[PDB]
Amino acid sequence: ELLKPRTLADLIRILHELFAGDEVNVEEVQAVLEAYESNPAEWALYAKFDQYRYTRNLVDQGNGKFNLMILCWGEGHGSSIHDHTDSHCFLKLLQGNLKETLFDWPDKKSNEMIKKSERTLRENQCAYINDSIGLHRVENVSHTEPAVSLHLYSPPFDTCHAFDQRTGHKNKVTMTFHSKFGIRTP
Ligand SMILES: N[C@@H](CSOO)C(=O)O
Ligand SMILES: [Fe+2]
């Protein structure tokens, strides 16, 4: 039974229940993420920005089944075009707006990767991606407003591929945490 999370801590407790088993009900998880109303005081501890690129801040390590983290995007900060390593990936906006651009998996032949679609993700909305859906790029295109997002990945993963938009060629990247549980982890 899905109830509205009252706070980030409550959301975390609910997520531990939803991931207690071996499978994932994507629509239920997205619905509970969306139902949490962002409260900046509750996540300020994790919202550690860097001037030059977006940061990844671990909030909860789940139950062996997922990682929950907060990403902090300065003005103009964005990602590579990337995949999600055979995992579910939910993104909920906590502050600001992000542009998500979708791309198909490239063919083996070298070619420009042309966007398939794009949308603006707005405060409190929860999006979902997985490799079956495609690849994406996520960007804070604002010149004036930093963005903060809450991401849930299941299973957890710490490597992915970045894709060259000009050719479709991929390179393996190791992801790092800027902080864990509020503690900077240089
Ligand atoms: N997947 C990117 C963020 S966009 O992914 O919803 C990352 O975890 O760094
Ligand atoms: Fe992503």
UniProtKB/Swiss-Prot annotation:
GO terms for cellular component: cytosol. Pfam families: CDO_I. Induction: By increase of sulfur amino acid intake. CDD domains: cupin_CDO. The thioether cross-link between Cys-89 and Tyr-153 plays a structural role through stabilizing the Fe(2+) ion, and prevents the production of highly damaging free hydroxyl radicals by holding the oxygen radical via hydroxyl hydrogen. Its cofactor is Fe cation; Ni(2+); Zn(2+). It catalyses: L-cysteine + O2 = 3-sulfino-L-alanine + H(+). InterPro entries: CDO_1, RmlC-like_jellyroll, RmlC_Cupin_sf. SUPFAM superfamilies: RmlC-like cupins (SSF51182). The keyword rRNA-binding does not apply. One of its GO terms (biological process) is lactation. Its EC number is 1.13.11.20. Pathway: Organosulfur biosynthesis; taurine biosynthesis; hypotaurine from L-cysteine: step 1/2. Fe cation binds at residues 82, 84, 136. It is an enzyme of class 1 (oxidoreductase). There is a cross-link at residues 89-153 (3'-(S-cysteinyl)-tyrosine (Cys-Tyr)). Keywords: Dioxygenase, Iron, Metal-binding, Oxidoreductase, Thioether bond. The keyword DNA-binding does not apply. Binds 1 Fe cation per subunit. Ni(2+) and Zn(2+) can be used to a lesser extent. Catalyzes the oxidation of cysteine to cysteine sulfinic acid with addition of molecular dioxygen. Monomer. Belongs to the cysteine dioxygenase family. This is Cysteine dioxygenase type 1. The lineage of its organism: Eukaryota, Metazoa, Chordata, Craniata, Vertebrata. The gene is Cdo1.
